[PDB]
Symmetry: D2
Subunit: 260 residues, 4 copies
């Protein structure tokens, strides 16, 4: 009997033991929650199934967030097993690699933009709708993951900046739409973390190294720190908070410039 005794949570975005989603799952499971998981396609099925069982779960559903059908069907199959749901965690973002490698103006094509926004922003709004029924049942909550490249420029984060800003406004629109029904909607803006969200990003070590120098606490956050703040936002302790973008960046966003 810990903080989330008897509570249920769907977790979209486990790719690896390094995912932010995995730090969240683990913090939620630590506190007594029962877990469900999506996987984007066949190739990942077996690795996700595997992670689910590590959490006492065998509730593992196909969900590619590009396909309208895949979304509703995943929430449908989940209705069979679950009465309701205490939260939906969205840890999904993606842009074609090329849009994230170079000058913003040169490399930002229309398809790269469509994919960035569709997978990284619209999808949260879609999952939310597909999940409304199951969330009204328990007055659960939604959480997504954003990045402060929405507010301030980072080199090569590019169209993902625009997509996250879209996400953030989404959070607010959802919180206003769903609050009436007692559904809370929040986000965590996490500092950079070495996950498979770094693969193919040439600058990544040097980004991480700058963060470590600039941030008030002089260190980079972990998936355990993002997890624990996710846990809080997913728990009755966060009952007075909706439409919030909670920064978990060891204070980086607060610095206008560091000792050089």
């Amino acid at each position: 009997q810990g903080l989330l005794a008897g509570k249920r949570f769907l977790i979209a975005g486990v790719a690896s033991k390094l995912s932010i989603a995995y730090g969240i799952a683990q913090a939620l499971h630590r506190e007594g929650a029962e877990l469900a998981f999506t996987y984007p396609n066949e190739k990942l099925k077996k690795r996700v199934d595997e992670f689910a069982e590590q959490f006492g779960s065998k509730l593992v559903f196909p969900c590619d967030v590009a396909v309208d059908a895949e979304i509703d069907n995943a929430f449908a199959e989940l209705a069979k097993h679950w009465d309701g749901v205490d939260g939906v965690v969205h840890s999904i973002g993606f842009a074609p690699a090329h849009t994230l490698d170079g000058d913003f103006t040169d490399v930002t094509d229309r398809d790269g933009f469509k994919i960035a926004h569709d997978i990284s922003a619209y999808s949260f709004v879609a999952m939310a709708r597909a999940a409304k029924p199951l969330l009204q049942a328990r007055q659960g909550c939604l959480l997504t993951l954003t990045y402060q490249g929405s507010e301030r420029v980072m080199p090569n984060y590019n169209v993902m900046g625009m997509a996250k800003a879209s996400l953030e406004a989404g959070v607010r629109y959802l919180a206003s739409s769903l609050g009436v029904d007692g559904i809370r909607v929040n986000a965590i803006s996490a500092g950079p973390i070495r996950t498979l969200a770094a693969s193919g990003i040439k600058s990544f070590r040097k980004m991480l190294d700058a963060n470590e120098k600039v941030a008030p606490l002089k260190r980079n956050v972990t998936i355990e720190e993002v997890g624990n703040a996710a846990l809080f936002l997913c728990s009755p302790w966060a009952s007075g908070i909706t439409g919030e973008i909670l920064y978990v960046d060891a204070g980086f966003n607060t610095v206008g410039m560091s000792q050089s």
Copy 2:
């Protein structure tokens, strides 16, 4: 020969005389600039031609921002007459009227979101890339229009809130991208004005009357006021300003509660 004597400006978005883009035109012509215009579709070629003739210009090109060829071609066409441009003004925004009516979570479907972001946000980035060689020659600037539904929730502004939030990040990324070449990128966040943008929005009237009671100046703003602001941002007086969102909203954004 006033503030913009012998400077060249292209204006995407005049549709009627209510348009913010017309307000901007009037203001830029008034201070001695040479103008050029685009139109979205045939239906409109006619009235835009007139308006351009009204502004002592015959540089009018087709530009539906949905089509990459058309963006590329309007800028390939323009460079025949001008070997440098002093600013491009982006005053285009659109989402399907169904996504602007009712509950955010219920109405915001994939194609609806896709269109909003594509026309309202991507288009400005694409227009920036096309105007780059033309802009680079005179160190002109870019300007776009936004609305504060990006930052806080308005009823029924819905997905446009997201698209505007995307747009505003675009302003910032373009600014950092294009900055080394001395191209400045700015936007105006204007208060609500009754224009063709108001059409099909049942709530608009009462929406406008709330603004009147809340704004510090106790009145709505006009396309003149927005035009004069845009003129400033396109003038040598704005030379130390880029990446800025300028609020022309009678101070509405600054008020949390008004005598109720």
Copy 3:
């Protein structure tokens, strides 16, 4: 042994059982913390002693933040009992009442401004330096209470808006200065609550009712909700978070307009 087992917290500003500081005390004690308290003057000493007693504590001191020596003092006294502290909660805001009633420009006078800024903002900074040696010894945190009247205008909040804004900048400055030493500094920005901070405030009822209509959750926040949040920011669950203003306002801050 719950979440704050074996941790120690000094709470400044419990004045009655409606207080913000009270819901915080109660939240930290519940989770195992041992508590210490200040009182502002002789006339409150008894109820605070009572309240400390309530929460298993005999650690209770005088501290008027107008007077440096009483700040140096109260921490010197505390060192006698504690060799290190896991956090100091500052829940203290005052302005002479005539500054909080009527027109901002008419009523904001030099002494009124001084006082508001002295007690409400400088005091967090004074307490921080005095607590530095003791916080350093356990890598504890700091927490203050702010209100959104800093960011957006509210009717007679007036010079307290200037105070809280100065305070919030305080939080950021403190965060960078104390982060190298592992000390996290945060704020909670609470929605409005009827407490002794309402007690003189002519339009308080009207605001509480407006707030409730505008908030996406359609209710006011409680001291239990602000308490649970302070607890979070005061716990190892918030290790990755510093310089943050957390909004526990039921989403109020995110609403531009609500059905009229």
Copy 4:
């Protein structure tokens, strides 16, 4: 007869030909306005009278913003010459040197704090009250100067950051309080400039270089640039704009991170 033909402006803060207020005075004179000036004390009377003569003006009054009488008297004295004023420009800020040098927590004492907020923030509210009759006659505007150190930590900027935060809040409360009289109140947030405000700030040059490398335009701003920005905000072209903070920093504020 330019844009401000036969308008009147009081300018508070001219110290040298390096001063922001000096760059402001030059821009408003350039475009036709008649000017008046305040000097802080006797040592300055000489140089201020000289500059006043440069921009063709006799109207020169003493004004130490620490002292209530001299504010009141300077505006009393002004009223004898002018029957209305079109705007008042407040380019004043001061903290004792010791607060601006080293660790924030260590160096920020009560008296340094009070002085910071009193000359930097209060002074504006005070000047606004006394200028009210004069501003009401002509529906004139106010303008102050701020620095982004309010929103994000600069090293050594320290208490001036708290005071600029408070000043910015004042801008918004003033705008709400005076809007009803058609009085606009705005600020410019300038990027750093070498002026007398850089005296004894040993870090200053390294700061200016950091600004140059990070800013999208890759250069620092000038008093001519802040001057023109101020001109615009003091002009009929800004009639739709109140309670605004206009950044004139070459986009510095929009960058989260620059190439290492």
